[PDB]
Amino acid sequence: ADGVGNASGNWHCDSTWLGDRVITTSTRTWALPTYNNHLYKQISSASTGASNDNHYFGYSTPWGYFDFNRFHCHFSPRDWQRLINNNWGFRPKRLNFKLFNIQVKEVTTNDGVTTIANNLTSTVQVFSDSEYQLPYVLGSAHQGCLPPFPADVFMIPQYGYLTLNNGSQAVGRSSFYCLEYFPSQMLRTGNNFTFSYTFEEVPFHSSYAHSQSLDRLMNPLIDQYLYYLNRTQNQSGSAQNKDLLFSRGSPAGMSVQPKNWLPGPCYRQQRVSKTKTDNNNSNFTWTGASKYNLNGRESIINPGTAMASHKDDEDKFFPMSGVMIFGKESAGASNTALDNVMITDEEEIKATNPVATERFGTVAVNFQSSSTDPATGDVHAMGALPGMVWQDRDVYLQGPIWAKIPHTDGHFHPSPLMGGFGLKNPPPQILIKNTPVPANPPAEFSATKFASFITQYSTGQVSVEIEWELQKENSKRWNPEVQYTSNYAKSANVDFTVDNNGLYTEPRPIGTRYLTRPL
Amino acid sequence: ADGVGNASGNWHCDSTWLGDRVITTSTRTWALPTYNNHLYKQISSASTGASNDNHYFGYSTPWGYFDFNRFHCHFSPRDWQRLINNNWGFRPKRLNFKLFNIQVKEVTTNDGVTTIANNLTSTVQVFSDSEYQLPYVLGSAHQGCLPPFPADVFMIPQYGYLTLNNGSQAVGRSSFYCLEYFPSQMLRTGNNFTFSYTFEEVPFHSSYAHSQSLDRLMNPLIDQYLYYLNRTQNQSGSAQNKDLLFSRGSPAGMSVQPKNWLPGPCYRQQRVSKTKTDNNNSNFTWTGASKYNLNGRESIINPGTAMASHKDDEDKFFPMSGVMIFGKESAGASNTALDNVMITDEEEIKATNPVATERFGTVAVNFQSSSTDPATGDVHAMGALPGMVWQDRDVYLQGPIWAKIPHTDGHFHPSPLMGGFGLKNPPPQILIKNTPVPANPPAEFSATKFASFITQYSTGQVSVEIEWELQKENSKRWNPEVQYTSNYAKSANVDFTVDNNGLYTEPRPIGTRYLTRPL
Amino acid sequence: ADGVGNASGNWHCDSTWLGDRVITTSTRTWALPTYNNHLYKQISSASTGASNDNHYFGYSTPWGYFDFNRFHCHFSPRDWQRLINNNWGFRPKRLNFKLFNIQVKEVTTNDGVTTIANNLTSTVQVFSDSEYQLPYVLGSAHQGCLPPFPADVFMIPQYGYLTLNNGSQAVGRSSFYCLEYFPSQMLRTGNNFTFSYTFEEVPFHSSYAHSQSLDRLMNPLIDQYLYYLNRTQNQSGSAQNKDLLFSRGSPAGMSVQPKNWLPGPCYRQQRVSKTKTDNNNSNFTWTGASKYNLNGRESIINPGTAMASHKDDEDKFFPMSGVMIFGKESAGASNTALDNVMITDEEEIKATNPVATERFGTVAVNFQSSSTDPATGDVHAMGALPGMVWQDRDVYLQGPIWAKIPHTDGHFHPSPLMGGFGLKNPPPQILIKNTPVPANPPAEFSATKFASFITQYSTGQVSVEIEWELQKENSKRWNPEVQYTSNYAKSANVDFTVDNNGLYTEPRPIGTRYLTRPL
């Protein structure tokens, strides 16, 4: 508790590298409006003309929420470079969150003159949902996270959620949540808020590419002792006669050579070229999409199973729904051109992972015999097989960090498909609201609910501190690695900087996979 | 004591279920106007054209008061479900009350421009009447309680009271009370108010229905050893001759079988159908009403004696003044249609209790003989008889909790007829007022009372914490119980939720009686 | 635990009088059949042609139960004489119950030859319902109690119960109980069963009559200082003129003399003569009955409110449903003659209690004036008034001892109307069943329930020990009391004895009220 004239916190944006730990700290200044005029609202797809696939039922809330779940909320571009060039992995360890220097301001409008003044006795309400009792809205990759650039002031997003829906209607099993029915701390201008959080144990994200591929793991100099069936008919000179001929795995035959392992799972997606003229002329984004069917309602699979974006020298192709796509600062919200988006490239994992736009392989579909020819078929979707190995999708400086693992009877490899760390108990949602301040009530009692309030909003600073654990690179590789680097040549701007108007931009996605490891 | 910039309390709305206890906590935000321009006023029915039955004399007060006496002030609908499905009873134990985050605001009007500003040095006055020295206005089911929905802001009702009246005049025995003549705490914006209260020992409210009825308590398989007079004339074949014939109680005769107990008291009320066309065409609500006569002044008995609302398969009928009726949010104040009200149904107690619209029974009114026929008459009102047992009226989620037992020489079963817990020493009245702030006085002294004040009002948060004791269900019943449930089918809205405009509604009354017990 | 050849208990029938305590002990030999072929059965009034007043729904059970609730189960006639001649009151204190010397016997029938043999390995199951979790069937005055005469062997009655019914159907709130879903002790022929019970604190039953009446409590020698209005018109000689004349209460005026107390409650019943020729010629037992209305279903009130059976020298009259009637051993079950029943006489309580067949009194029904004559009306049913005093119904040697007070929100004077001690926690029901013994199963498995059993039954001894507390007679009365006595004259039989065929009979009811007390 502080008075009116004492600051309740200090600005801390820093990055500290010690041993196998790096600690990031970021401070931003925020602004919180009143949402929904202090009301909870039933929201629905009703009377929107929505397709069956787009129906929803839910509620909008008066509350806002803090979202720091993206990597540029924490690492600067230089810091991200230090991470990805020097480290085979990393994971989050613990978390510290602070709200301070609260200012609540009332807004008065007379004629066209808006006047803003301090309201020193008003409060804001803050609580974290530590027991995960609310619908968890983080991890859907929503905008409204802390800005990448520390000098930018950001608006706090409005909290809302969805429940079970049949069309645009609800079901008796649908849940409604009042956030005023949790406890929350109330803060005047001298108060501050804090809590800490510990990440559970998670695997290090793999920041590296394999320097080998699954099918190349053999000694190139040595034969095997295993035999395979090489030929079902002998050549002779006269005519082809049925025969059974066997060869042992040799270096000339690496493709037919027996192996211990299989590539990872595959769900095939449509291939689309970054050159317009190569693609079919039609709108196939929905009709040609890889989709799943849930309760008679289709949803595009995206980004889907972790798969290589393209094979060698096909770099102009990308999976239609299968890659993370970031917008530039010049991108519009809908139907923006290719030059305004940044399409990530998952190419590093083609060592262990199927290419996203190709079949997993071929299977025998029949019994051959002297009468009937052997037939095969393509496998476009392949589930887990014993012996499969795969890499998870890479993360990105502007991509998400964690997702909440759904609470369910069963999981298979619960790594979030957009990338990052799947968490049973993720960092909790932090909810904030301006406390309603009634206007002058009438002189005689009325039992009707107050609709009349003093217009106000709030602003302050927020700090997030995350400790990260590093996995060091042990390699015996003789030759130099690939590194992320900035271009040394001259240019009009510097990457990851403001322009002459003050607009901070991010030139490109930066993944984590540069250093190499044997497979 | 806190400064201007420090919050004096935190938001707490919660429900905690531990063992046989549940603790409810609710926080609301309130607004307090100035009432009566800081004046006490004699109020009366004079010059209102009131009927003799409606005359009154009393006083209106500058003070407001807090009323939390309803069950939805405390239990959420889900919490109410947990209570009524799992428990045979419950009672209040202790109470905690807090006022905090006080803001006093002054209102200035120039032309049509209303300006609101903080007045940091103004106070509000608060006291609880712990010794019950004021007329106790709680327990009359007045509106102005804490809203059911925690996000709603409510206006504080004005305190007033009545005293003895002869017509519209007073009597020398009538009392006037100045509330400034109690001690009270004065609160600036940094101050807060609290007190705690302990409920006295009261019976658990019975939340259950009997799985037996009084007249069915016998073994259906076995005869009695008691005889009753079965016939006063023998059949023979020729003609009816006077005779005295006796039978012992058997299973075929359960209605004539001797018993130990009587149904509870009865005061009959007029039956009215929920279908208009069944009712008589006339306005009988006053002329056909069950009424009591007090000092030459009639008052409708309502809801009156606890009685079953209807008998089997008569559900369309209800006692005219004999049921609790709640309004929907669409109900007007006067002469609203049936679809805007919710009529409770007391049907569960027909096991031990007379039906409200029927006679208690029949009595012999004469001496029979060979000359004179035996005559009976109907008993429409029956007072307490030794051997009577009865159930009290049920409570409801939106109904009242307690009433103050009048302080009198005698009582009979002092359970409040609207339902809930009769208390000798109820939760005290909590009175609040904005302290008058004179405007600029004249430059020369005048002994005349100030009529000129700075217009202001106040707002803050209020917390109520009640600990409830639970009585667990011990049943050996084999088959499943009736439970309160929400409908599983789809619908446009969810019960007990806000709509798309933010309006919270309660779809229906919810009583407590679901689980069963043997009689 | 005993073997086959050792007795598990001894015969104890005794009565011990020590100080203010008397301890009764009674042993009987019992026989338990298999009921319902080991089945639970839904039972109903359906397809019985029952009147609406007689409908029921319930279950019959395979179990039997022990019922000792009658006074001759405990006191011999001589012991009952000692009690009622020497004591102003008495109440039960504690209880001891034992089952022992169990013999289970299997019955085999070939042709017309029934053969009975010991089955040494069969069991019986016994449990007491201590938590009152079953419908309590004791206290309905059912036959099947221990016989009055210790040498008589009695059959154990079948347990059954009723639940809520709408007509002959059930309601979702109706309860079904499986008695195999309680724990129970299993007893082979060497095992025995016991438990003890403590009565709660209850008032002494009043065994005495008042030697005064309420209206005679004054000093016959002395005037009062209170005045009453004696005459509203003066006599003069010429004509009757309006006047107000007042007299003070004197001994000549005992009827008009102010008093402190009122007689007890009254619910009037029809008067019927023990001489046929006096009664009306019609069957009025149902149509002229005092009845209560419960859930649209009529039940005769019987015996009803405790009231004097007749006034002075009207002994030939009795209340139609208002007295306890016992059958002689020669009585049939239905429509037996007056000479086969024994009608009790409640005459002793006419000191404080209204006569059952007469009005409670008269009330003013109007406002008199010079124009309109004063009018009165008869009060045939009167509930509790402040200042009423009354006596409870007397008990009888062959009448019931206790009843279970229904578990309800409210009671008024919860004394059982058939007489005896109302108990919140009565002596528990003791349930007994022969354990099913399958016959030879088929040689191939079937999942169908066994319908085929070895026919058997059981027999043993039961002991009940009750300690009674006595209230001694303190009287200063000079002259001899009325006493219960046997007739000294010669006769063909002795009262309360067996006849030459071995049949034990009880000549008459014996109440408790002989000694006197001032009022």
DSSP output for A281-316: SS--TTTT--EEEETTEEEE--S-S--BS--TT-TT
As a residue count, chain C comes to 519
Chain mean position to CA C358: 24
Is residue C90 within 8 A of residue C204, CB to CB? The reply is: yes
Q: Report the distance separating Cα A459 and Cα A189, nearest Å.
A: 10
Is residue C229 within 8 A of residue C246, CB to CB? The reply is: yes
Q: Please list every residue in chain C whose beta carbon sits closer than 8 Å to the beta carbon of residue B221.
A: 43, 60, 157-160
Collapse the DSSP code of C392 into the 3-class scheme (helix H, G, I; strand E, B; otherwise coil) and give the result: coil
Q: Dihedral angle at the C-alpha atoms of A169, A172, A174, A176, nearest 10 degrees?
A: 100
The 10 Å Cβ neighbour count of residue A350 is: 21
Cα–Cα distances in angstroms (integers) from residue A146 to residues A68, A70, A143, A400, A460, in the given order: 6, 8, 9, 12, 13
CB contact under 8 A, A183 and B151: no
Query: Does an H or E element contain C431, and which?
Result: strand C430-434
Count CA atoms within 13 Å of residue A321 on its CB side: 20
Q: Dig out the tokens for C490 from the structure.
A: 């010669």
> In terms of DSSP bridges, do strands C430-434 and C57-66 run parallel, antiparallel, or are they unpaired?
antiparallel
CB contact under 8 A, B482 and C172: yes
Q: What type of residue sits at position B179?
A: L
Q: Report the distance separating Cα A178 and Cα A59, nearest Å.
A: 10
Optimal mutation site among C277, C279, C295, interface B, most CBs of chain B within 10 A: C295
Which residues have a Cβ under 8 Å from the Cβ of A433 and sit 6 or more positions away?
Answer: A32, A35, A62, A63, A64, A124, A125, A179
Any idea what DSSP says for residue B276?
G
Q: Report the distance separating Cα C496 and Cα A258, nearest Å.
A: 108
Collapse the DSSP code of B297 into the 3-class scheme (helix H, G, I; strand E, B; otherwise coil) and give the result: strand
Q: Dig out the tokens for A110 from the structure.
A: 């007379």
Is residue A100 within 8 A of residue A192, CB to CB? The reply is: yes
Collapse the DSSP code of C514 into the 3-class scheme (helix H, G, I; strand E, B; otherwise coil) and give the result: coil
CA distance C506 to chain B (A): 13
Chain mean position to CA C251: 42
Q: Report the distance separating Cα B222 and Cα C154, nearest Å.
A: 14
Q: Is A351 exposed, middle or buried (0-12, 13-18, 19+ CB in 10 A)?
A: buried
Q: What type of residue sits at position B74?
A: H
SS (H, E, C) C329-391: CCCCCCCEEHHHEEECCCHHHHHCCCECCCCCEEEECCCCCCCCCCCEEEECEECCCCCEECC
Cα–Cα distances in angstroms (integers) from residue C325 to residues A5, A173, C298, C397, C414, in the given order: 93, 61, 21, 13, 22
Q: What type of residue sits at position B379?
A: V
As a residue count, chain A comes to 519
Q: Report the distance separating Cα C58 and Cα C61, nearest Å.
A: 10
Optimal mutation site among B256, B313, B371, B514, interface C, most CBs of chain C within 10 A: B256
> What chain C residue is nearest to B365 in terms of C-alpha separation?
C380
Q: Report the distance separating Cα C285 and Cα C276, nearest Å.
A: 14
Q: Report the distance separating Cα A462 and Cα A12, nearest Å.
A: 10
Q: Please list every residue in chain B whose beta carbon sits closer than 8 Å to the beta carbon of residue C289.
A: 362, 376
Query: Does an H or E element contain A84, and which?
Result: helix A77-86
Smallest CA-to-CA distance from B195 within B64, B100, B70, B71 is with: B100
φ, ψ of residue A348 to 5 degrees: the values are -60, -25
Q: Report the distance separating Cα B342 and Cα B344, nearest Å.
A: 6
Smallest CA-to-CA distance from B368 within A335, C118, C290, C361 is with: C290
Q: Dig out the tokens for A73 from the structure.
A: 């909320």
Smallest CA-to-CA distance from B228 within C154, C269, C355 is with: C269
Q: Dig out the tokens for A417 from the structure.
A: 């498909």
Output the DSSP codes for C174-205.
-----GGGS--EEE-TT--EEEEEE----PPE
Q: Report the distance separating Cα C354 and Cα A248, nearest Å.
A: 119
Count CA atoms within 13 Å of residue A366 on its CB side: 9
> In terms of DSSP bridges, do strands B456-472 and B21-32 run parallel, antiparallel, or are they unpaired?
antiparallel
Output the CA angle A49-A54-A60, nearest 5 degrees: 90
Output the DSSP codes for A357-423.
TS--EEEE-S---SSS---EEEESEE---TTEE--PPPPBTTS--EEEPP--S--SS---TTSSEEE
> What chain B residue is nearest to A437 in terms of C-alpha separation?
B459
Q: Report the distance separating Cα C422 and Cα C413, nearest Å.
A: 9
Q: Report the distance separating Cα A82 and Cα A193, nearest Å.
A: 32
Count CA atoms within 13 Å of residue B50 on its CB side: 16
> In terms of DSSP bridges, do strands B262-263 and B388-390 run parallel, antiparallel, or are they unpaired?
parallel
Is residue C269 within 8 A of residue C303, CB to CB? The reply is: no
Can you tell me which residue has the tokens 């190569």? Answer: A278
Handedness of CA B299, B305, B306, B308 (dihedral sign): negative
Which residues have a Cβ under 8 Å from the Cβ of A42 and sit 6 or more positions away?
Answer: A57, A58, A59, B493, B494, B497, B498, B499, B500
Smallest CA-to-CA distance from C77 within C29, C27, C24 is with: C24
Smallest CA-to-CA distance from A263 within A347, A386, A353, A383 is with: A353
SS (H, E, C) A340-365: HEEECCCHHHHHCCCECCCCCEEEEC
Q: Please list every residue in chain A whose beta carbon sits closer than 8 Å to the beta carbon of residue B492.
A: 46, 169-170
Q: Report the distance separating Cα C431 and Cα A480, nearest Å.
A: 91
Q: What type of residue sits at position B219?
A: N
CB contact under 8 A, B219 and C140: yes
Smallest CA-to-CA distance from B205 within B469, B464, B460 is with: B469
What would you report as the CA-atom Rg of chain C, rounded to the nearest whole angstrom? 29
Q: Report the distance separating Cα C165 and Cα C171, nearest Å.
A: 6
Q: Report the distance separating Cα B361 and Cα A135, nearest Å.
A: 59
Output the DSSP codes for B161-172.
EEE--BTTB--T
Chain mean position to CA A65: 18
Is residue B260 within 8 A of residue C405, CB to CB? The reply is: no
Query: Does an H or E element contain A318, and which?
Result: strand A317-319
Smallest CA-to-CA distance from B5 within B126, B122, B107, B120 is with: B120
Q: What type of residue sits at position C514?
A: Y
Q: What is the largest CA-CA distance in chain A?
A: 114
Is residue C33 within 8 A of residue C457, CB to CB? The reply is: yes
CA distance B494 to chain C (A): 26
Is residue B510 within 8 A of residue B344, CB to CB? The reply is: no
Smallest CA-to-CA distance from C71 within C342, C440, C381, C468 is with: C468
Any idea what DSSP says for residue C37?
G
Any idea what DSSP says for residue C482?
P
Output the CA angle C245-C250-C255, nearest 5 degrees: 85
Q: Please list every residue in chain B whose beta carbon sits closer than 8 Å to the beta carbon of residue C67.
A: none
Q: Report the distance separating Cα A460 and Cα C151, nearest Å.
A: 96
Q: Dig out the tokens for C363 from the structure.
A: 């009330």
Smallest CA-to-CA distance from B81 within B483, B470, B436 is with: B483
> What chain A residue is nearest to B150 in terms of C-alpha separation?
A180
The strand pairing partners of C498, in sequence order, are: C504
Q: Report the distance separating Cα C306 and Cα B260, nearest Å.
A: 11
Q: Report the distance separating Cα C126 and Cα B390, nearest Å.
A: 34
In chain B, what is the straight-line distance between the N-terminal and C-terminal CA atoms, in Å? 56
Q: Report the distance separating Cα A302 and Cα A286, nearest Å.
A: 12
Q: Report the distance separating Cα C244 and Cα C60, nearest Å.
A: 71
> Between A and B, how many residue pairs show a Cβ–Cβ distance under 8 A?
178
Can you tell me which residue has the tokens 């010397």? Answer: C101
Q: Report the distance separating Cα B94 and Cα A360, nearest Å.
A: 69
Is residue A307 within 8 A of residue A356, CB to CB? The reply is: yes
Q: Is A389 exposed, middle or buried (0-12, 13-18, 19+ CB in 10 A)?
A: middle
Count CA atoms within 13 Å of residue A400 on its CB side: 25
The 10 Å Cβ neighbour count of residue C299 is: 24
The strand pairing partners of C475, in sequence order, are: none
Any idea what DSSP says for residue A428?
P
Q: Is the peptide bond before B374 cis (omega within 30 degrees of 0)?
A: no
Handedness of CA A238, A240, A244, A247 (dihedral sign): positive
Q: Report the distance separating Cα C144 and Cα C121, nearest Å.
A: 28
Q: Report the distance separating Cα A334 and Cα C258, nearest Å.
A: 99
> Buried b / exposed e across A106-135, counting CB within 10 Å, b at 16+?
bebeeeeeeeeeebbbbbbbbbbbeeeebb
Collapse the DSSP code of C456 into the 3-class scheme (helix H, G, I; strand E, B; otherwise coil) and give the result: strand
Q: Dihedral angle at the C-alpha atoms of C161, C165, C168, C171, nearest 10 degrees?
A: -110
Output the CA angle B434-B435-B438, nearest 5 degrees: 120
Any idea what DSSP says for residue A157?
P
Q: Which of the other chains make 3 or more beta carbon contacts under 8 angstroms with chain A?
A: B
Q: What type of residue sits at position B396?
A: Y
CB contact under 8 A, C324 and B391: no
Q: Dihedral angle at the C-alpha atoms of C148, C150, C155, C161, nearest 10 degrees?
A: 40
Q: Please list every residue in chain B whose beta carbon sits closer than 8 Å to the beta carbon of residue A44.
A: 500
Q: Please list every residue in chain A whose beta carbon sits closer than 8 Å to the beta carbon of residue B189.
A: 121
Q: Is C242 exposed, middle or buried (0-12, 13-18, 19+ CB in 10 A)?
A: exposed
Q: Report the distance separating Cα C289 and Cα C285, nearest Å.
A: 6
CB contact under 8 A, B265 and C383: yes
- Interface A:C, ≥3 CB–CB pairs < 8 Å: no
> In terms of DSSP bridges, do strands B361-364 and A317-319 run parallel, antiparallel, or are they unpaired?
unpaired
> In terms of DSSP bridges, do strands C421-423 and C402-404 run parallel, antiparallel, or are they unpaired?
parallel
Smallest CA-to-CA distance from B208 within C409, C419, C440 is with: C409
Is residue A420 within 8 A of residue A402, CB to CB? The reply is: yes
Which residues have a Cβ under 8 Å from the Cβ of B48 and sit 6 or more positions away?
Answer: B54, B168
Tell me the technique behind this structure: cryo-EM
Count CA atoms within 13 Å of residue A172 on its CB side: 6
B364 vs C177, C264, C270: nearest CB: C270
Is residue B261 within 8 A of residue B216, CB to CB? The reply is: no
Q: What type of residue sits at position B285?
A: T
Q: Is the peptide bond before B265 cis (omega within 30 degrees of 0)?
A: no
Q: Report the distance separating Cα A82 and Cα A100, nearest Å.
A: 31
Q: Report the distance separating Cα A32 and Cα A156, nearest Å.
A: 5
Which residues have a Cβ under 8 Å from the Cβ of A18 and sit 6 or more positions away?
Answer: none
Can you tell me which residue has the tokens 């009559």? Answer: C209
Can you tell me which residue has the tokens 């393209």? Answer: A310
φ, ψ of residue C343 to 5 degrees: the values are -95, 120
To what resolution in angstroms was this structure determined? Answer: 2.3
Cα–Cα distances in angstroms (integers) from residue A479 to residues A347, B20, C295, in the given order: 21, 72, 97
SS (H, E, C) B187-224: ECCCCCEEEEEECCCCCCEECCEECCCHHHCCCCCCCE
C74 carries a ligand binding annotation: no
What would you report as the CA-atom Rg of chain A, rounded to the nearest whole angstrom? 29
SS (H, E, C) B29-50: EEEECCCHHHCCEEEECCCCCC
Can you tell me which residue has the tokens 């089952």? Answer: C99
Handedness of CA A204, A208, A211, A213 (dihedral sign): positive
CB contact under 8 A, C383 and B385: yes
> Buried b / exposed e across B418-444, counting CB within 10 Å, b at 16+?
bbbbbbeebbbbbbbbbbbbeeeeeee
Collapse the DSSP code of B64 into the 3-class scheme (helix H, G, I; strand E, B; otherwise coil) and give the result: strand
